[PDB]
């Protein structure tokens, strides 16, 4: 009988400073050996957590964050932002009959030269005095709106850091900026940035990672 | 301390829920000692365990399943069995899982399950002690585990195209087995 938990060891995960509270929880690894060091088994190891926990506010409950472990010190694992996504039950609740679904996406490089891809979604809605049932839009409108949205996303990136972008997504200010630009074209509802996925990353330095923390 | 569950209601079920509301909460407030509230801001209901007098975690799950079933379209007095009995489950699938068919072929299939005046559906819900709802392409079956499987095999054969009369013959046999 091995009972491997004789050999396992526990570490604490420390989210970056951008988030309101940062004790994520624990993970376990076998005790280190001269043959191979444990710290190499900790590196990578993405963690996925509900944003409503990091912020302590349940209105965020349908959004999820990925964190990737990049550094180890003193049995604390120091970790960096890695992606954002919706929960699947929420997304199914938006799609309904008698309306149009609009999507846009673009790939772009941050000022600290991460390369990422970002997805936006929006839906048409009725005017308050409408009588006809189904609120569809013509294709000339859809192309126009999709062009507008693509422009905004490519200027909100080139924020000075990947961390500055994170500070934009939490208060979801960008949803309001898209709302203002499309105002003239068509009435829209449930404007959301749906997903963010990180494609490539620069040469590592500890300096930036320590600057994000104590 | 605290733990809670939240479940969304689709919009066509919203109005039936309000009309029933006065009948649905008393069993949750009384029998299970849960506390519950309706959140219109996010079109959901939320259920909370009161720490002072709840018995065991089975109370919290029983509450959720009862509300869950109602949003699928089962009647209130059919859903309520999930509080009082303990062996009930829901099975669900959609016709494209069995055979791919699209136009009037698709419409004819679900019409073959209903039968005239629902008589074919009504018969299956009697020869097997179960309840069935048809929501366009999707079928949901409520009952006991062994009963579920007997219902499923019969309805699958209707969408594969067997004539309704032949299936009646099979039901009489299955119903004889459940005389036990």
């Amino acid at each position: 009988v091995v009972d491997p938990f004789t050999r396992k060891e526990w570490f604490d995960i420390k989210a970056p400073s951008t988030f309101e509270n940062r004790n994520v929880g624990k993970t376990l690894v076998n005790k280190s050996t001269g043959l191979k060091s444990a710290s190499d088994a900790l590196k990578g190891r993405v963690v996925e957590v509900c944003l409503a926990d990091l912020q302590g506010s349940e209105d965020h409950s349908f959004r999820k964050i990925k964190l990737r472990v990049d550094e180890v010190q003193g049995k604390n694992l120091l970790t960096n932002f890695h992606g954002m996504d919706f929960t699947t039950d929420k997304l199914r609740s938006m799609v309904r009959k008698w309306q149009t679904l609009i999507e846009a996406n673009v790939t772009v490089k941050t000022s600290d030269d991460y390369v990422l891809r970002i997805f936006a979604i929006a839906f048409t809605r009725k005017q308050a005095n409408q009588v006809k049932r189904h609120s569809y839009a013509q294709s000339s409108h859809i192309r126009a709106i999709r062009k507008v949205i693509s422009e905004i996303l490519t200027k909100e990136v080139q924020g000075s850091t990947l961390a500055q972008l994170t500070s934009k997504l939490i208060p979801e200010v960008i949803n309001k900026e898209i709302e203002n630009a499309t105002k003239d074209i068509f009435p829209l509802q449930n404007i959301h940035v749906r997903k963010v996925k990180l494609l490539k990353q620069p040469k590592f330095d500890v300096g930036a990672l320590m600057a994000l923390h104590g | 301390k605290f733990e809670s569950r939240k479940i969304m209601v689709p919009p066509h079920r919203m109005t039936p829920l309000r009309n029933s509301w006065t009948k649905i909460y008393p069993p949750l407030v009384e029998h299970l000692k849960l506390q519950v509230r309706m959140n219109l801001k996010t079109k959901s209901v939320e259920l909370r365990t009161n720490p002072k007098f709840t018995t065991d975690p089975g109370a919290l799950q029983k509450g959720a399943d009862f509300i869950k079933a109602f949003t699928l379209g089962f009647d209130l007095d059919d859903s309520i069995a999930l509080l009082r009995l303990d062996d009930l489950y829901i099975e669900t699938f959609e016709v494209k899982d069995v055979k791919t068919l699209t136009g009037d072929h698709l419409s004819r299939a679900i019409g073959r399950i209903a039968g005239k005046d629902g008589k074919t559906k009504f018969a299956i819900e009697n020869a097997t002690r179960t309840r069935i709802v048809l929501a366009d392409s999707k079928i949901h079956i409520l009952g006991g585990f062994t009963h579920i499987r007997m219902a499923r095999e019969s309805v699958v054969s209707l969408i594969l195209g067997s004539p309704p009369g032949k299936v009646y013959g099979n039901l009489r046999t299955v119903a004889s087995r459940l005389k036990e």
Binding site: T27 | R5, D56, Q61, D97, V98, L160
Partner: protein, 127 residues
């Protein structure tokens, strides 16, 4: 303190898996399946077998020291059916009564944008 794990439940026809891991998902605490707890094949999918599997896993979690657990529920998906069968529902009920604190719950069944061809030929096949 709570020390959350995460429980992965995979329900299908023919069998049900119960599986639980560290929050990072790499290290596995315990597994076991319905088929391990019953004699005959025709029973591997039964809800009864699912309850036995869940009770067994929960005991070992307390022994290692996990006290709370997020849960991810999965059906076979792909070209197959997408909603977790009754075997998965039974497992979830049994975990709740174990005294573990259930965290958030999510459905993670894989869905295609649009699929490759389904098995069983043109004339259909009994699911």
């Amino acid at each position: 303190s709570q020390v959350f794990g995460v429980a992965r439940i995979y329900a299908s026809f023919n069998d049900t898996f119960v599986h639980v891991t560290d929050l990072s998902g790499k290290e596995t605490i315990a597994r076991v399946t319905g088929g391990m707890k019953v004699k005959a094949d025709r029973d591997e999918s039964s809800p009864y077998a699912a309850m036995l599997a869940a009770q067994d896993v929960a005991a070992k979690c307390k022994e290692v020291g996990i006290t709370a657990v997020h849960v991810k529920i999965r059906a076979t998906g792909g070209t197959r059916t997408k909603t977790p069968g009754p075997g998965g529902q039974a497992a979830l009920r049994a975990l709740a009564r174990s005294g573990l604190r259930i965290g958030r719950i999510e459905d993670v069944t894989p869905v295609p944008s649009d699929s490759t061809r389904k098995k069983g030929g043109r004339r259909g096949r009994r699911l």
